Amino acid sequence: ADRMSKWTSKRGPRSFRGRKGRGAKGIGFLTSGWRFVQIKEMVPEFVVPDLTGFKLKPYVSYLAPESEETPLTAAQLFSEAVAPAIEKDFKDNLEKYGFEPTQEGKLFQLYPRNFLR
Amino acid sequence: LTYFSARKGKRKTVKAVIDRFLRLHCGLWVRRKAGYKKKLWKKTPARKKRLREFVFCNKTQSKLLDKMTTSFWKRRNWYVDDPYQKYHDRTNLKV
């Protein structure tokens, strides 16, 4: 008889209490007899770098020059990414300069996103 | 009667009167003495003579019928050969 409070896993009878998750991802599947099989591939392996010798810290000194907000736009990226190669080669049929026409044969597809932050 | 129509909002007349009474323009109403067409075979000749007559309606009846009819049926009507053309006006009325 309470309908305003959120509905979460702590609410129903045994069945409900079990079925309803809590926002937590899955990593495996139930086999016969309520046995759980975990898959090493569906567990996010963190990728932490080697921080030794790094010359940057959580904050930046107050003695730094200011600048203008210039968000990176497709034109700005293209300008210094591939354009100079074109111009250099313009003085004497697009995949040679980084163009990727289709995105089935690469591990990190850009659309749809098949990878994670 | 209906004092305001649902579709226009005007007064409306009771058409059961138009088919029964004639309004002489200057107030009077004439009717036709119910009981006159039918059963004319055991009525005395004098009674038949009375029943054929066109009779007037007294004050209350005339006011009632004036209420049950809009303005259109009270106008001045100039018909070509109107048997009641000479009765539209009163002449020499003392009070």
Next chain:
Amino acid sequence: ANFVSWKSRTKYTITPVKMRKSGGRDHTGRIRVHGIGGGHKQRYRMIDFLRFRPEETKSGPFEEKVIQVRYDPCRSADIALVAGGSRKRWIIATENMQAGDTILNSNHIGRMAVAAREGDAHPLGALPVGTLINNVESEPGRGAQYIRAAGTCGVLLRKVNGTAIIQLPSKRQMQVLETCVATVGRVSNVDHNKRVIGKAGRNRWLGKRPNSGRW
């Protein structure tokens, strides 16, 4: 109402299957027939009525021998498990059928009437006039629908060209093609009439309940 009727099995097998009672409720959900509900749980044994059914890739009249003649809740008669070839079937048994007997099942109309044992299945024409039959069928190759109840005898009355007139237990006749397969004898469990159930509890056990109304 989500009412999937229980009679959903397709394959045939002698194992009892799990009845679900109805209580008079049809698929909509309303009392269609008053006076039904409750009573003992029951299982259903798929009694096979086409008593002339030859096994896979075989033909010709076949003999089968019984194994047991047991009570059955659904019927009023007593079923019997007959084994033949490589196949077991539940068939309604007649009165004088004991475990171990043998029975013939034929469709072969002989030159004249063949004296048939009191449990065998023969086409109507094959029998003589004046015998008693059960498990009659309306038309050939259809199945037994007529006399099946407990202790009911069906007399054969006469035969004419291509047909036979039989007398049903309700004291009236009907015509059927002479190739319709019946069984000769009287259906088992005789004198089932004389079952004084004694007390209302027995009626409740069977499945009936007392219902006022029936508008």
Next chain:
Amino acid sequence: ARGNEYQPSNIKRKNKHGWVRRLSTPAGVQVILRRMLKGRKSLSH
């Protein structure tokens, strides 16, 4: 003795007044839409 007609049960409550039961019939969608219009923040039980 009366007054205790509500014997609570989450299964029943979610089965006979829940989102899916409303959305499983035109009348229920009308109910949800009425309660969307009136402003409610408890559309379904």
Next chain:
Amino acid sequence: PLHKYPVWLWKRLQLREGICSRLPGHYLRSLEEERTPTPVHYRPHGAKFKINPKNGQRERVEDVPIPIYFPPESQRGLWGGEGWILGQIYANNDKLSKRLKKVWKPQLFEREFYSEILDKKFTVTVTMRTLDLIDEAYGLDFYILKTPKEDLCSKFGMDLKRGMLLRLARQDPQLHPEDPERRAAIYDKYKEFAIPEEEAEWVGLTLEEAIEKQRLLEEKDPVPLFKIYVAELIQQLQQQALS
């Protein structure tokens, strides 16, 4: 408050805003246009005026169509224009007896009809009126080809019409291969209902089907901006080079 457009103009407004706005003009014209169906269940008054007997003066008259119901099962057949009449009757055909409910339904049949531009036999449910109209029209193909959308009132009929009109417009060989003379004979026999393909594709489509067709027609994978930007770069470089 008050809207800026009435309620019944909202449909026509919608036909100008969104995806419906890019549909070809002729389809929109065929959709907005309204035509009265040919009278079926009532006797139309012959003339625009008439003398009535009660008084004797010349009064105007119009014919007010009976409203008729077409259950969806008819959309799979060719009922002609016929349908159900849902209404009331006076019990003894005297006005002082109860007002009773009444439904009049057509007598339906199933039959087989041969379409020559389609060279196919269809099984269709029809009514005596449909057969009489077909005979009066000298064949099923003519009946479906000359009758307008409103008199047919059958999505099946309009689909047949779209097929036949497309077959005529394309002049495609698939009608009767291995005998081009018969092809030419059949195609030219109906040469009068020969409208261009661009108008043939959209004949009979309901509005929803039209929207879906337009969407499928225009839906397209966005062009990679890499090609666009390299094209702009090449244009600028050529301009700089020629200077």
Next chain:
RNA sequence: GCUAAACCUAGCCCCAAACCCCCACCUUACUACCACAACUUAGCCAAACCAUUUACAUAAAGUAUAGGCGAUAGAAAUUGAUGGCGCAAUAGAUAUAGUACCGCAAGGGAAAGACAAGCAUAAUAUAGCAAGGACUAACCCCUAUACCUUCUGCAUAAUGAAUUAACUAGAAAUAACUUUGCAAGGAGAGCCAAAGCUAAGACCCCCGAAACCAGACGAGCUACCUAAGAACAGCUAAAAGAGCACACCCGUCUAUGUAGCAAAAUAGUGGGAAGAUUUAUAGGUAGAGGCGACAAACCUACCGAGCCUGGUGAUAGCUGGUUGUCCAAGAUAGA
């Protein structure tokens, strides 16, 4: 002297103009992840019943026409087309909010923020609608049958009122009468005109049924049924709707209780208690319908017909009310 009493705006009403806008979520909604489908308003209500019938620019015209020719209904041809003598916290929207809270559900639906009554300071003194005439004097003396509404008048015959504050009930045509304009013509097209036309001024309330019809919501209580479960000591007797009697179920008789501990309980006394028993869990039957070991019994505390929203401001020849001052005419033949 307390209690209080006071305030402004937060907003809103009616117009004009302009056509309006990261993740999860149909399974048990807000849950990363596996093999069907949509397409005539009845009736409350008028006819003083009710049965055909009964409404959803200006002018022509409430005319033709329809109609138990009753109540009432009713054309066309043609004609021509930013603001406020609004509210200001019981008002204005229901709104600070569709929140709190009520209901299982559909659904219902709030409140509010900035020396009035009641008392104390200060209990009363024969006698009496609590006052008036007065008196030197408060009482004492003389006079004096509360108010509203309904019945012929009512001693209170009956109905209503504890008391204060706020809010709460006469909207309009046909004629007529009065005062203006113009006057054989009036009127800013359509209409009237044998002194009439044009304009203004004056006159027609509030609350209340049992009901009816339509569409939704309900079988978590109870009636019955389904699926798959559970309980039944001990003694006597052995396969029994068996006897005595616990748990469990019911509720015979009496007493308590009657705003109660409880909108049906408590204490004792009682019937059944291996069965037609009792019971937890999910599903089903839906309102002229369901269910019923028929009692008009039960379907969420109120069932000879549930409940909610809408038609609905239902209708009511019936009951109750109807608000400033002063004066004047004013009553019981009959069909």
Next chain:
RNA sequence: UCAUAUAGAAGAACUAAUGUUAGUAUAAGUAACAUGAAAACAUUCUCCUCCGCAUAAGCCUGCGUCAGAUCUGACAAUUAACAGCCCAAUAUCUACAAUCAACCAACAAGUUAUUACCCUCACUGUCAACCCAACCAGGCAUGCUCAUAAGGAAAGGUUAAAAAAAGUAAAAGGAACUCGGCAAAUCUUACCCCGCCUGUUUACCAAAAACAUCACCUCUAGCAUCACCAGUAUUAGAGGCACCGCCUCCUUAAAUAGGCUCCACGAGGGUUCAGCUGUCUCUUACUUUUAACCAGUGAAAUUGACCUGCCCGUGAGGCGGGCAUAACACAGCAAGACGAAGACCCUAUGGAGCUUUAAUUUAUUAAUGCAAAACCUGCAUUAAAAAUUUCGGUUGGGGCGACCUCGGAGCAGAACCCAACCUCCGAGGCUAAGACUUCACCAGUCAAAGCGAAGAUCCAAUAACUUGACCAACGGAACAAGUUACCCUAGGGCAAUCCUAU
């Protein structure tokens, strides 16, 4: 517009709608509620429980710490092995109960072979004094403890008035009480009526002599895949009845009470023997709760105002005539303040029903019959099934029964008019001054002269000249009865004949 006046406007005025909202009163500081004892705050003692612990279901942080108060905020917490969350496909199978399962005895009849996979423990419940009853001597399934190892506190302090409630004891007598042996104490017997038995029923006034029930009988039905039914005349459905067998004067002293056969049973009804008892003759004592007082917290119906007496009379605290009369608490009582739900009679052209041989219909279904291309469509007839609808007036005592329009005689003695279910009886040529009238209207009535001859309206058939039945409930719904013990709403409520004494 002056800038309180002259005008124009309008949600324009409340001693009263069991009006609505808010404030505060009265009854009222009244009814009711609560904390076992001592103490050294560590503890000890007295007494009680069909209770307690856990799971389930339900609820969702709801007596853990700290800090502010008499509840608010902050902080903290409940760790999976228990429980939930499941399953690769295809074919095959899958006859025999459970009851310590063995003897007897029954009826209600109760998974694998092949193909594919060599992956590992993630996710959620986990708290409490708890849930449904507005806060609660109520409701709440299962396992285990069967009187407790667990859980609790019947008395805020006092005194020991009445009336009330529960309990204990009682001399002699033992139903004389009373409608009745209800209650209580004791435990026996006998019969009679009804129903065969166990069971079920009016949740919340009826548990029964009613319903159901075995047994019997009657009626209908010859049969497929959604009920009856995976059934088939010894079957299924619908009815009546109620196994079975047999037939279609005594009682008391006294008495209006009790006295088709048919075992068993009944919280059924009536009667009786014996006992038993405070039921009674006839009450009494004590205890507990209530009670009264002190302290804390603190309602509700009710209320026109009250400065609220008695007797007699009128038609009664309040009027009249007499009498009485310093003010004020507290506890009692129930004669009066017509003291604060439920019934009965009548009315409504209110509502809802039930039955019909009351009126209207066949729209829907089922039969036929006729056209339409072996099945559906249209029309007609017959029926069932329903659907909509109504219940005139005066009246013995409301009901029964009569009458209901018009006319004539007494009341109404002498212009006019005046009631009766008061008093006695029948009927269904045309034109035109002026008038009369049935107390309205509608109708009705007389008529000089002059000219010519001697019971309504609407509807239908009609060329017509006009025409009729019903409307007799006779100012007339075009066509509608019986009834509501289940009813609901709005409302109203100086005796002819005689008894007795002088």
